[PDB]
């Protein structure tokens, strides 16, 4: 039976460690895929880890310039959470250098994008079989979430971008049933910039917190009904969420220009006017990670907050981070539980190696107490190469 998403986000006090895959430490010897853009998404029975491989293993020559981003060998595969991604435990999903995926209660929907930069195509699959296709409409790198999509009452939603990662680009929301596009709407978002959105379902509606790689240090959002009627904005909190970003201060409900000319994928959970913010600890590099609870931070502008919980130390490498949900039909709870993952990027451009790849760690909602600490990748570089 389909996942009803009419339930609300579960109240919580902190975050508890859920998984850690040590893929990079293990891959030092083991046959572990070199990856990037990993993300967790759960069905009504299990939770999986999706990722984009480089069609090569760690410590092998084919792992060479795996910093390039888009290639013909890039593929989307999955394995159960906490496990190291290997050819011996990974399920093939699709050929792709940018992807998304979600479970509607019945079957899995995977979105993989491949092809050249001037005409990339999104192949949609439902239970492994191709159910639709979406071709680039601006011919400038059609790309997507790199985190799970959201399903509600049997419909799943996602967000895509086409155009410059440099300035005004085109943005679209898509609704799908059985992996087929039943409706789509382009957002009329002049001056906004949307990339790699982390979307979750709450009370029958979707909410997405994304990345402004053009000119924002704070994160932009988009929420919508099952008819794609939407609203847009930026988190007004002075506790800036992008990286790079400036020192905390006075935020704005609009794009914060200072230092937001690049970025990193992230997420945030909205509760009333409050927001849980996941962000790096550094303001310049993808180092460290922490969770901050700013009550009344979604609508106000100030750098004051209530709680902060360490996830990774400033001295250790972090990277992308996304949100993922647990539905009542998998949990037995009467609310939609929030969790998040963090990508731990090793290699280039920061480290002198011939390769780039990443590990993952994840946490979940919870009302019981927690603790901040540091759960870093742990590999010692360089490798035998």
């Amino acid at each position: 039976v389909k996942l009803a998403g009419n339930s609300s986000l579960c109240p919580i006090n902190g975050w508890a460690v859920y998984s850690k895959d040590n893929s990079i430490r293990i891959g030092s010897k083991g046959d572990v895929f070199v990856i990037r853009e990993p993300f967790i998404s759960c069905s009504h029975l299990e939770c999986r880890t999706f990722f984009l491989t480089q069609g090569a293993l760690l410590n092998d020559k084919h792992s060479n310039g795996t910093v390039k981003d888009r290639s013909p060998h890039r593929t989307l595969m999955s394995c159960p959470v906490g496990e190291a991604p290997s050819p011996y435990n990974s399920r093939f999903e699709s050929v792709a250098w940018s992807a998304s995926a979600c479970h509607d209660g019945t079957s899995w929907l995977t979105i993989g994008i491949s092809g050249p930069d001037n005409g990339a195509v999104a192949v949609l699959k439902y239970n492994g079989i191709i159910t639709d296709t979406i071709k680039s409409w601006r011919n400038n790198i059609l790309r997507t979430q790199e985190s799970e999509c959201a399903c509600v009452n049997g419909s799943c939603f996602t967000v895509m971008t086409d155009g410059p990662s440099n300035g005004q680009a085109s943005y679209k929301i898509f609704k799908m049933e059985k992996g087929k596009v039943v409706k789509s709407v382009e957002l009329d978002a002049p001056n906004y910039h949307y990339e790699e959105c982390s979307c979750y379902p709450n009370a029958g509606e979707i909410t997405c917190v994304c990345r402004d790689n053009w000119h924002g240090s704070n994160r932009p959002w988009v929420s919508f009904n099952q008819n794609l009627e939407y609203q847009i904005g930026y988190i007004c909190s002075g506790v800036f969420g992008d990286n790079p970003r400036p020192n905390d201060g006075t935020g704005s409900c609009g794009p914060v220009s200072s230092n937001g000319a690049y970025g990193v994928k992230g997420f945030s959970f909205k509760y009333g006017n409050g927001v849980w913010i996941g962000r790096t600890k550094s303001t310049n590099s993808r180092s460290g990670f922490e969770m901050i609870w700013d009550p009344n931070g979604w609508t106000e502008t100030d750098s004051s907050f209530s709680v902060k919980q360490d996830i990774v130390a400033i001295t250790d490498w972090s990277g992308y981070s996304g949100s993922f949900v647990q539905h009542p039909e998998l949990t037995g709870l009467d609310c939609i539980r929030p969790c998040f993952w963090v990508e731990l990027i090793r290699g280039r451009p920061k480290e002198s190696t011939i390769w780039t790849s990443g590990s993952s760690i994840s946490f979940c909602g919870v009302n019981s107490d927690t603790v901040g600490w540091s759960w870093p990748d742990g590999a010692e570089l360089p490798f035998t190469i």
Copy 2:
């Protein structure tokens, strides 16, 4: 319940990437099988990749002269689509240096040929247990499809050749049920030459497009009803499908002798008087791949065609290619969906390695739009050896 095959091929506009195993790039370090002759075939529940191993792994000494073709260690195995063939994820099917396979809706049927060249024997299995045997009748390398057989209303059919790959040889169509040959017929096709046929079910009948290794540059075909009543011909198009072959020009409905003394296994999908032709890009070697729609090309002699979709660039190695299907019981559609796979050969005799193996990529029908691009093997030879 048995796969019904009374439906027609789904109408289509282009091809959407379905998978890429990256086995060779992965095998540089991973315990991946050395193979050749890989093909895809689906049941009413999953799609799998079959292939002929060389009882050895990549980058190991036993990988030596793996260019030999036939030997006692050659075995037919399978794993899920897109995954690299390895001993930790592959199901053993049969001992064979030539095979075929298809699912009738109930169980898998596998056909593996082993034994000496002067008296080979095909072993038929149904759900993993031997159900029949077919021994060579001409005593000269009994061989078969190297791709999926076709099943209709409980019956599965295949084609086998016995005799010279050099000139006139004998060809037989077999009809089976629960893996037992209930009927067969020897094709009265003087001056024709059949090999590595790609057969597919359509409107209750089978259609096979094969390879002329004796004297044809265009491909031969055979279609037949469930009682083995058949018709034979050659694709008349001036867009020659074999490799080697001559530059495009005036085709023929009979064997085009120029350059057809050799060949490569291939496929083609017939729609009315039109055909989707899959072929290499080079006219001499196994380089590149492309999809071509020549309406009225199945019966007409002209090198004019409508659409062209690139799959593999001329600068990269390709190889065998075959057709495979997605029945309604698996898809939910009301038509039989056409898909294809391409074998990417690396090593001897074109590269200076001590071995020969291959990777695979596959695509499927689709009405939505698509894009041409290039999805090559990507491994850099030579290996550590």
Copy 3:
């Protein structure tokens, strides 16, 4: 249906070899996890081996200081009994450097403790999803069993410690249902020291034999009802079970102070006033192992016993050992079968390697005859390093 735990320990005579994973001998080449603190636990259908990896593999550089005990990369995983723990056959369970686990008949309950020594938090999971959390109440290394928990009539119970591994500490017994803590009690055990308890169900109650690391050469025990009403004491048998320990002699029903300033993890099965004692053969190091039947050494003080059954020769490295149970719902028997496992520790600090890890062996109850022997680890150190 829930595992009723109202049956009694089956009457037995000796122990029969159940399993041996040779993980270390195998990892010399294979991709085996470097581990410690392993233990078995069974459901109503299968038996698994749980363990705490070091987020690295044998014979790889990351295997370095794997002697350190606690780290962020330490994770709790599991695989079927007898199989070598590997990233290709292990299910991820939880991030932890101390754990426990058991099956209530319906789903698996896992307990993984992580975080800093001054603020560790226990993450309880039921069927893979977080259901409760427990933070350190004495801010001094919250730790647990390192062996299975015990479930009765739908409820599972475990024991945890917080405070000095050096002297008087704080001990608590928890009661959980579907992984949620419904009740907890602190033992009023002045002068006692509980650590790494082995608890088993019997006649509707729980019995634990633990490790006194503070000042006992004999072992302490706790037994309690389903409402956490309890009783405490020490095994009085002059056949001292802790290691190190003094030569056998006159025991005590309280802490035997000579040599018991350290210890190792163990177990014991109480029968009437008698006991089956598992122990190392050495009085000083974790060398050798043997089972001893002191009929009524549970309450009596005399170093005399009836049967001795060798499990590992004095010349070979041994280590931790714990109890694990079969239930009637799994076995079909009408009694609770006792079984135990043994950790074979190789590496530091006794051998000159840069790492520490371990193999496992197990035995089960049984009435028919048996024989003692020696089933050591068998790996030859050092390794390629």
Copy 4:
């Protein structure tokens, strides 16, 4: 439902190849266990390969003196037929240096002997849980089949030996239900010698053809009803089946003393007064294998025969071989089908390496035709060592 064993052996004309695992060729690089004494057995759903590992992998130092036979690290494991035995694809079964196993229609019954030569104990397991124990009764290496046991109407029977491999030893037949010994009888076989019997069910009774290591070149046999009422004898054919053995000549219905002071495990299928013999091609060493049809050869004494089918050239190493069956509940047939396997031993003592391991190949009855050929191991020694 239980496997009725009331049907008779299926009439056959030759033997078709069923599988080949290439375990050693693959092990050159892959993580393949080192093993000996492999054998196949089938349930009502699938066929598996059991084997006794040496607790190490090929091409690793721990693969050293793996020629010793018995050791504490020896374990019984299994994987699907055709697959190379590895720690990634192998199910653990029991600790043993001698074993047997069979499926009764409901669950697997495994038999694993371990312990010292003067007190070995066989641990029986039903569905993975210990159901009985049998201790040595002569204190001289209790040993068993090293192939599959036979099940009929819900009962499985096996054969065990205790005593000298040097002369008169004690032989016993065991009958078990759900893994528990319900009856047992000791054979009154003076001047007979039974070891490593291959037993198959037929018309509700069991027939075993074994190895005489004492003083016989021909093979001894025992057949018995479901109440262990039995009959013994020796195959009378002058086509001697043991190895070593003298050149073919005049056989004997009793022990043929010339050259039978040692031997190898083998098998045979009796049809009326005829027999299908499996044997090596060489009379001195375990080289080559072949099937021979000697009608009226079970009771007569002559070296003449009707059919001979080659399985392994004399130029290549063979080794143990045994029988296995496929019941009607698996095949759908109305008769019990005969098949067999052959162990291809490589290394010591015939080859200069530091190890000993084996590969496997198997065949099945079949009415259709077949062919003789040579399917050897194919590994090139020595290895990197």
